[PDB]
Structures are given as C-alpha cells and as structure tokens.
Symmetry: D2
Subunit: 392 residues, 4 copies
C-alpha cells in the first residue's frame, strides 16, 4: 500500500488515460452527453459507470473524492461547495422528524445554528453530551437516537472525544457516527479507522491550505455516501463544488503532509512560548504536557495540530489590545491557511450563540484563538511577543 504523500499526489489518476496529461484536465462543464438515450437512461437509473450532470457527479470531483477517500481510509468520498454543504447534506439525508441526534458539547457556530435554528425546527430532537464521558453518552441513548455528531478537537477550545468509545456504543444501538475532522485532516487523524461511519471536513481550511476556495468533503461507506449524494446534495442543498475549485483543492492536498508538519512545529513553539508567559491564564494546546486530555489526544492524533486557544489576564480588554497590536498575524476568522490568523470566537465565529449559550457550552470571555501559519517562527514569535507587551 503506497504511503500517504504518494496517494495525496497520485491516487486514482493515471496520466495514460487522459492523453498523457501529468495534471488531470479540469472538467469545467455542467452537463455530459450520451451516445444513445439508452445509455442515458441507464446513467439516471444507476446501472452504468458514467456521467450526466455535474450537480450529481463530475470526473474532476470524482478524482478529489476517491483521493480523499483513500487518505481517510474510507470507501467513498463526496465533494461539496462548503463545509456547511457537507454537514447539512449529510444530516438532511440521515435524519427525519422523530429521530434524535446526540451532539458534542461544543460545535462550530454555523453547525450549532443549523442544528438548533435549522433542522431542529423541523422536528428533529437535539441533545448535547460530553463525548469524552462514555457513561453519560450511554445514559443519553434512546431508541430514537439515529445519529451521533461531534468535532474532535472541538472548535474552539480543543475538547477531545473518545472516538473508539463513542463508536463502540453506537454499534450496539444502531447509531451512525459522524465526525467533523476539519482541524486534524486525514494526515493527523482518521476517525473512520477508530470506528466512525462518516467524516466531514471544511476543505476550505487545511486541505486547501491557501485560503482561496470554499469547499466541503464527506467520506465514509459507499452506502452512506451514495445516499448523501443522491438525496442531500442532489435534492436538499444543491451545494455543488466548482470543478475549478476542486482542482485547486487537489493542488492543495499535494502538500498537505508538508504543510501540516510545519503548522504543528510552529504551533508547538508558540504554545510552549505562551506557557512561560505572565500575561497568559490558560492554554488549550494538545501538545503541551499541561493539556487535560493529553493522553486521549495522543491515541487519536499523530501530531498536536496547528490551532492554539488561550486566555489573557486582563480578560476581554487585554484581548482587544493584543489583537489590534498584531502586525504579522492577521485579525480574521478561518484557519488552516499559509497566513497566520487570530480571532475572538464570541463576537465573531460563534456570534450565533447568545451570551448565555456562550457560557453554557464552554465558550470563554478573554479567549483568543490562533491558527498558526507557515511563516518563519522567529517572526511569529516576535509578533506575539510585542503584542503581549501592548496588551498590558
């Protein structure tokens, strides 16, 4: 079996089948023609390998999908217009009124909003459980429980889930487990190999790597993904990925291993620096010995990742002064870009939450999230250093 970097570059593509083209040609076309109507009928009915319409399927998208499937150790992949496209397309097809879904305690803002203000308002029961607490999860299960959805690590406080433990329990009850693997990527964590049924990504982040596209990926079993393609995507979201964006995403994935290594190495130095600093109160970085879930993080993630969260003594006031003083880090939402980014999740990425919902689900007061980029660490260090002095 070829290695991870080899498959990220080559999997599912032989140049000899596309006139020798080293880079696959981009199928920037909306529709496909048939040699006969009989051939066409067969494509819609499902009984033929082939194409008809890019919302359903497209060869550039198919390559991305097969390749992502290989990196995650899944059977099938699906490409969508956004991470939210992936999550909604997935959850819209698996759930109906009277089904319940068990969620991780903390979710990405628009995931939270979709669950509570979106699909939750169409008769689907929601309940939040700590997915590190196995006995609390077992107690939460009902016969209505159809899906278990969570992020690990969780946006934006780094809370881990026991994916093996959760999936053991889900097998007993006949529940489908969906893991948002955006933060880690398949290079660092493969929830399907820990017993998850489906993984979703915002391919907008690390998988793209360069901040120039919005995209989503689902990977899992052939049977789940075929349902998500033919119902969620085709009929319920229409979250179709541009073939052009899919080729940039494939371009990004070719350096995923190298990029993640550098995100991790830079993030480690910055986190360790931030530990030894008088202005810092807490730190959530999985690679610090201090990290409360350090043991669980190491059983699931091969490296501690590119994201750091921390609080300052000074609270919300020092937050503003720190961020506004950054000269190399940029003040923005998003993560997993070559550029280093800094954000305040309560006013920005999780601004769908009210002040009570902020506090209820572990989203703090003076919390600053860093997405550590690929710049020279000395420059990043100097910038964080001078920004701490400015926050007094």
């Amino acid at each position: 079996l070829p290695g991870f970097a080899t498959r990220a570059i080559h999997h599912g593509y032989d140049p000899q089948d596309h006139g020798g083209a080293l880079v696959p040609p981009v199928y920037q076309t909306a529709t496909f023609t048939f040699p006969t109507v009989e051939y066409g009928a067969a494509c819609f009915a499902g009984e033929q390998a082939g194409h008809f319409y890019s919302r359903i399927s497209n060869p550039t998208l198919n390559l991305l999908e097969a390749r992502m499937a290989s990196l995650e150790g899944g059977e099938a992949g699906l490409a969508l217009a956004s991470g939210m496209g992936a999550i909604t397309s997935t959850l819209w097809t698996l759930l109906r009124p009277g089904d319940e879904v068990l969620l991780g305690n903390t979710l990405y803002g628009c995931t939270f909003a979709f669950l509570h203000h979106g699909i939750g308002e169409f008769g689907v029961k929601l309940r939040h459980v700590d997915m590190a607490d196995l006995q609390a999860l077992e107690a939460a299960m009902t016969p209505a429980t159809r899906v278990i959805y969570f992020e690990s690590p969780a946006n934006p406080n780094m809370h881990m889930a026991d994916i093996a433990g959760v999936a053991k329990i889900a097998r007993k009850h006949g529940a489908t487990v969906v893991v948002d693997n955006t933060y880690c990527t398949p290079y660092l964590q493969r929830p399907l190999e820990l017993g998850a049924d489906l993984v979703v990504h915002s391919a907008t982040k690390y998988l793209s790597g360069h901040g120039d596209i919005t995209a989503g990926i689902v990977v899992g079993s052939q049977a789940l993904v075929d349902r998500i393609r033919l119902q969620g995507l085709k009929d319920m979201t229409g979250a179709v990925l541009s073939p052009h964006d899919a080729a940039l995403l494939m371009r990004g994935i070719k350096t995923l291993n190298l990029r993640m290594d550098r995100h991790c190495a830079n993030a480690q130095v910055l986190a360790e620096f931030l530990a030894r600093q008088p202005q810092v109160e807490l730190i959530h970085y999985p690679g610090l010995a201090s990290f409360p879930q350090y043991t669980l993080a190491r059983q699931q993630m091969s490296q501690p990742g590119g994201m750091i969260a921390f609080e300052l003594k000074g609270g919300i006031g020092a937050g503003r002064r720190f961020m506004n003083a950054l000269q190399l880090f940029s003040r923005a939402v998003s993560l997993g870009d070559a550029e280093s980014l800094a954000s305040h999740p309560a006013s920005m990425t999780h601004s769908s939450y009210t002040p009570e919902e902020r506090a209820h689900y572990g989203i703090s007061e003076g919390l600053v999230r860093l997405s550590v980029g690929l710049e020279d660490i000395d420059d990043l260090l100097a910038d964080v250093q001078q920004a701490l002095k400015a926050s007094a």
Copy 2:
C-alpha cells in the same frame, strides 16, 4: 434608467474603484481580515458594511447579485452554487412544519423530489394546483398557505401561469409568491414586476449561456434575500458559489440579450418547421398561434423563448430513434447553452417521478424537449429533418 444591455454590462461597477480595471478583479478568497477587532465585531453585527467570510458574502458575488437584481428589477440578489441551491436555500428559510406550499402542476424533477421526498417529509404540506386556473388557486388557498411556488413556462410541457393574477390572490390571502424564471431570464420575463416576491434561477442555463458553470440566483426584496442569505445559505445548505464561477456567470450575462435573441429566432423557425412535419403529433412552443396560452405568452414574455416540446406520432419508439439519429444536436439534459440539446424524458430522466406521477402531473412518454442553441438555423433544420425520417 439605462437599457437592459447597458446594465448587463455595467451595473454596480466603476473601474475607478478597482485601480482602473475594466473587468472587476476576481476575489478568489475564503476570508477577509480586519484592521481592528471592534471593526470586525461591527461587521458580524451588521453595524458595519464590510466583508468577513465568503460563504456569507463576497465582493465578486455581490457584483453578480447587484447586477442580477437590476436585471430582474428587484432590490437585492443572492448567488448560490446551483439552481437547486437557490430553490432549497429559499424554501428552507421560508417554510416550517405545518406551513403549506401551493405548487405549480408540473415542476422540474429535482424540485419535485426536493418537495415530495425532502422538505415535505419534514412536515411541510404540499398541494399541486393548475396555476393557470385562477378560480382553482383561490379555492385551494388556506390560512396555512405560506408559499406559492411555480415555474412559467413549466418544464417540460411549457405550461404557463398568469403571474399577476396569482400575485393578486397571494396579496389577498397573505402568501409569498416564488417564481422559477430559469427559462425566460430577466431579458424576456420579470416576475417581480408582476407582483411576485422572489424569483429563482438555475444560472447554469441561459444566464451562463456556455455550459461551463453550475450556479443559482435568488432576487427579491432586501428583507427576504437577507433572510435567505443568513439562514438558508449560511446554515441550511452551504451552497456557496465559487468567485471564479461568478466571474464566468457575469461574463455570460454580458451577451444575454444577444444570445436570447438568437435562441428565440432559431426556435421560432424550428418550431414552425416541426408543426408542418408528418411525424409530429403535437407541439408546444409559446410562439406558435396554436399554443393553448398564446395570448398569455405574448402578454407576459417579450419573446417566445428557446425551448420546444413536441411529441412524435410513433410514441416512445419513435422518440428514441429520433434522439439517437441527431448528429449536431447532442443527447443531454440541461438547456440554454450555445450547443443545441435534446432530451426525451421517456427513455432518460423519466425524471425521478413514478409512472403515475409523470402521467398525473403531465409528463408524456412520446415527448421530446429541445433546447435550441446558437448554431446556424439551416444546419439545425437539416439535422432535425434527417432525424425525423430516422424516427419512423
């Protein structure tokens, strides 16, 4: 007010704001940075006009949106990853369990599937009505009727609705009218100017014109479009349009008037041709005097369009052989490309309907649809001619 063609080329853009660039630069970027976190907080709150993240809003997409709104004569526009993206984003935000939607008698297949197998399985009630029979629409109205959704002309049989008449009834009872204006474009028909509240397009078709992107547009009031953006798109579908694809859509839109004029003139000649041929049983073209709703067509559409539907005397067998015989026309779904396209739902997309629902909602088995392209009319006639001999 500048002419349609002037606005399709210029509206919403001054080169002087973008370094003199004649063509707007493409904002192929996922995220946008802030100069301060208080500037950032103001953007998320709506208190500051600015950009943060492309799934919510992006300047290339905003120009497309503003231009399309001008062309439809409406206040605001939203760009999405597909026509289905437009439709689902729209209806998910407008409807909740116990709401009722009145539907045109015949709908595009994936719209039909979305309604009956998607949103209608989450507790939204559906009723189909003949939108040309105004008495029957009035009689079907209930206090739970929140949305009237239809296409005019409706695919594949070209059935029309009196938009102003429907809008009147909707105004009386207090319902929102949503019209799928894909077939006509704002160039031939403007449902907002006849009392409709929202219009949706598969911009994949005539607005693009060249078959190389998938895309959707919603136009209506600022109030409604803001809700569809911040709820339907942001949280419930994630059907984000690529900035690259939006730029190509704008490019297509600049020749919209010219292309539609040629589409219509070609289709008229072809329709008049087909009506005189011995193999043709029935033909539906708005520009033929024999069209059932000819008066309504001339009232509502400034030209009869590029789409033809006809039936061959010899049933499904003849349709198949007609389709297989075409050399210049391609056998494909989709419509409104430069390339002429034929589809015979009976031996293709019967169209995710049942045989009973096909026959009940008006989709015959001898029926072929033509999207008449921009080729030389003599070449198109000669291809059709020989395919009719072959049909026997």
Copy 3:
C-alpha cells in the same frame, strides 16, 4: 447533402470537438498541465520527431490550445492555427521565423504602435530592411518590390486611422515576385474579413480584442498554411519568443468565439448608428467610418469587409484641446486603450497607443493630433448616443 460546409456560427461553437471523445463533456475539459507523459520511451521518441501524433510539452502544443487553433483555422479558412500569449506574440513569433538579416519587409503605411516599434527598434536593428508603402496604391507596391523583399506585412483596416489595402491585389503582386503576405486581421475578425481567402499567406490577430470580446485575457492567433504555421510554432514560439498561451485563457477565448457572430453584428450596428449621428454634428471636422459613403476607401471596404466594423475615428473642431474636454466628459464610454470589448472605449492614439512614434513619425504615417478613436461596444445605442451627445455639448 453532407459535403456542405457548416455555417460560421455552427463551426464557431462545434468545429474540432465531439463530446464522445472526452467522456461526454459538453464543454471541452481544460488541459491546465505543463507537461505530458509517455507509455513507453519509444512513444516519447516519436513525439520529438513526428512519427506519432502525440503530446509532450505545452509550450510546443496542448489539446486545449489545439482545439482553439483548429477552430480559428476553420473560421479563417486556413489549414492550421497557432495560439500565443498576445497579439504581439503572434506578430513577433511570425516575423522572427520568416525574416533574417538581408531580407526586406514591405510594411503598410500605418501600424499599431508596438508593431511599429518592434520593426524599427527591434528586428530592424538586427539587419532586416524595412520600407513603408501605401498598400492601397498597387502601382507603388509593385515599384517597391525588390529581389530581397521576403514579407509584405500590413493591417487592414489599419490601427488607428483605418486605412485599407486591397488584399487580393497585394497577393497577386506577391505571387508574381515571390513574397509571403502577412495580414493583421484584428479589426475585422474572420467573421467580417478573411484575408487567406483573398490570397494572403498568413493572418495574425490580437485575440485580446473582438475574438475574446470581454477584455479579460491577453492572446494571439496566427493562421495559415500547415508548413508556415509549423515553422512559426517550432522556431518563433518555441525558441524565439516563448509566448505560450495559458490553457485557461485559451478556454476563455473559445468561450468568447462562441458569440463572435452576435457580438460583431451588434458592434457594427451600434457603430453605424453612432457614426451617422456623429457625421451630422457641428463639432466634428472629419469622421472616418467604413460604413459612411464619405469614407475615403468606401468601395474597397464594401468589397472586402462584410460589415463596416466597430471602430470610429474622428476629429473635433478645437483640435487636441477640444479632444480632451470631450473625452473627459464621457460617463458611459471609458477612457482606455484596447478595443473590441463589451464596454465602449474612447482613446487618443498620439499620446497613448501610438506613443512609440515621435511627433515627426505621427504626422508622416497618418496619425493626427486631435484624433479621437472610439471602440463602440455592446451597450444599448440610446445610452451611447446620449453620452456622446452630452460630451459634445461639453466640448464646445
């Protein structure tokens, strides 16, 4: 029957592409790839010496670029095409392969600025002889032919005063003496004029202009005989310019070519109405538009061009001074160089697109001060009229 040539519009959309040979894709997939690989070493042996019809490197050849080329060839009525990174890429790649020190090139009296500079300050400084000739004067062209004359090169209509040449007459002289005729057909496109059908050996285009139609790419095309285009490909482009067209840009060019006939019809109808409006105006000294009977070469235009085009050149009374106040007052027209965009443009050649000329060279080669060039776009004609009208009022 089936030996009928398909119509221009049909060929502009379809020629050289069958969806069946690319998994049914209706639009051809874009080969955004630098290099191509070989199944065996021996298959790759035959691609650097042509036994096998196959690909190796995009600077020489690429399937997206080849489709563009075969299609432009069909539209121009030539055997072969070559796509390049710009108009200047097409011209320089062509002239660098055809000329060597000691050869003479006879040139039209007026040339696009960068072409002029290329000839006088570029290739003219490497031992190539230049002489200008009025190509509308067939007796003078005959008199200028010498045994060293290798290439006759001109634009028709010329940029920017729209001087014309009799292409068929120039070619007949060239047949007798043994010279290669190269016509720059940027202004007309193959929709309005086809110099290869009138006897020319090569045509070149700034596809940046009407062929693209939307101002978003820079590109060139050369069309001619297989032997001359192969020479240009393997010498001019490969070794002497490296003016390689991006497959992305070639795709966008093909996209624009699909509406070339419709866009040109509207450009020509808009410009005709605008020219007739401008002829009837107090402030205009002279108006040059091929569709007005007052055009100095009216009958030659009617003879060679099927429609009069989208370019207008005129002078105001008030001279250069009045020119600035008119152009300054425009609000729908844009002040900019280039042409053949959906957007209507207005410019001043002597300070802009013919800056490569000195004051001496502008007056000698037919470029006035006070000349206002208009590229008439695809906007609603009433809007363009209203804008030019109000700008005339402000130029008094």
Copy 4:
C-alpha cells in the same frame, strides 16, 4: 528583515489595501481605464504611477514580481509566459549584431536552439566556455562580450559555475552576467547576492511546483528589468503571463521552502542508493562527496537540489529498459513537479540524433535524469529498485 518563508507568503501585499482580502484578488483584465486623459497620457510617459495595459504591467503580475524580487534579493522582477519568454526577452534586449555572448558549455535544449538557430543567425556571436575555469573565461573575454549567460547547475549533468568569480571578471569589462537559477530556486541559491546582474527562471518548474502552469521570471536591477519589460516583453516577444497563472504561481511559491526541503531529502536518499548499485557506471548529484565540484556546490547552494543524473552500464538498451519498467516515476521531460519524473535523453529527446552526435554534447548513451518528487521515499526506492533489475 523577515525570513524567507514569511516573505514568500506576505511580501508586497497588505489585505487592508484590498477590502480585507486575505488572498490577493486576481486582475484578469486586459485594460485599465483613466479618470482623465491627462492621467492617461502621464502613465505612458512614466510621469504617473498607474496602470494601462496588462502586456506592459498588471497588479497581480506586479505582486508576483515584487515577491520574486524579494526572494532573490533583487531590485525588480518581471513575469513572463514561460522560461523561454524570460530568456528571449532578456537576450533580445541586451544584445545587438556584433555583440558576443559568452555561454556555459552545455545549456537547456531550447536555450541552445535560441542562441544558435535564433539570435545567433541575426549577427550575434556565440562562444561556449567552461564557467568554472576562471582563466579560460578571462582569456575568452573580448570587447564584443556584452553578456555572460549560464545555468548553475547546468545539465551535462550538474556542472557548476563560480558565479562570484565570473562576476569579478565581468565587472572588469562592463559585461552583464545572466544566471538561469531554475534548478535551485531562490530558496537554495541567490546569484544576485554572489554578484550576478540578472537571474532568469522557468517558473514552470519548482516555483510553481505543481505542473499546472507555464511561466518565466526575470529578477535584477530596476534599470535592466525596465528595459526588458519595455522592449523585450512589450515589443520583441509578447510573452505575457496570464494573471490566472501568476496567481497559481504565487500560490505555489507559498510552499516553496517546504517542497524544496522534501525534494532535496528524497533526492539525497535516492542518490546514496543509486551510487552503490552495480548497474550504475556513474552518478552526478551535488550532495555526494564524490561530486567533482562538491566544495563549489556547497559555497553557492544551501542544499544539493532535487535533480539527479546518472549513467547505466548497459548503455542505450539498459536506459530504455529502466525507463519502461518505472511504475511510479512518469516518463516525461520537465522537472520540479510534485510527481517524480524520469527522462532518458538517448532514447527520447535526442533519439533522432546519432550515437556520435550525443557524445560530444556530453550525453552518455545510458544517461538517465530524475526529477525527484514529493512522494514517500520508500515507494520511490521500490520503483527505482525494480526498474534497475529490469535494466539487466
């Protein structure tokens, strides 16, 4: 002075100057408008710092140019359609008939062809000289010598020049030293800091990194680059780089450091392996202690590069057998891609030639050259291994 990786991501771009866009917007526009014709006339004369036409200058190309200038430690950059674009625009600008150009002993095929069959047939004199041998180079200088042009490393294979020594000699005669730095990239070697006047690149190779664009770069002093822009590019080649491709090139450059590190580490492993094999007569790789110019290589290059050339004992026949048995390496010319590439010039690029022609050019019958990609080294080793066994 920020680090290399930081500058490769950030240099010359502030998001705040473009509505916050994290990634720079792509100026896919041929022309630029003016607010007045006064402003317009000034741009052409050089008195006003604006934009007018993308063949001369474009904001997206300018950013690429400033960034490459920074990485090479030069005053100014120029982006062109290809590496040959950059070479030809440079040489057409600096040379006239009767000038002499002093050349490295071996050159890239198309460079050689340009010199001998292009500009050389316009009265420019050519002389080849060993650029490591300072006394022969000094001896070869004439008053006609205006340019000294070479690659380092070159490709007969990997022969190096003493760039600081060449520059010392050129300064005594006013001559301009142009170095093709394609193989190293600015990350490994910066010829301008060792005294060269101009560097050219085929950015098609490592700078892009992904095999998807053709592009060239020139970096040097403002006055030379200005003339190459306004004469070579503008008038003599028209080798204009698409802004789309320039954007992809910039995207590629953000991982340059990480890719070059991995190219080099894979190459070092394969070189060590190949040097010990019985099938291998001879090997050229700068990282091997046996490399003839090891000391000179280490003075100029921070790492030994991703290219290896070696000679098999079985001659042309074993060369072919090796190539044909490769499963993971592709048979292709070009280099610097994520995909590993092999060429055997004796049976590919120079097969039309005689066994005597190849000999005097420095091309052994069994000479194979490898562009070592970014795949996992164990897979590359397995592929090279079995191919060596098949070459017997």
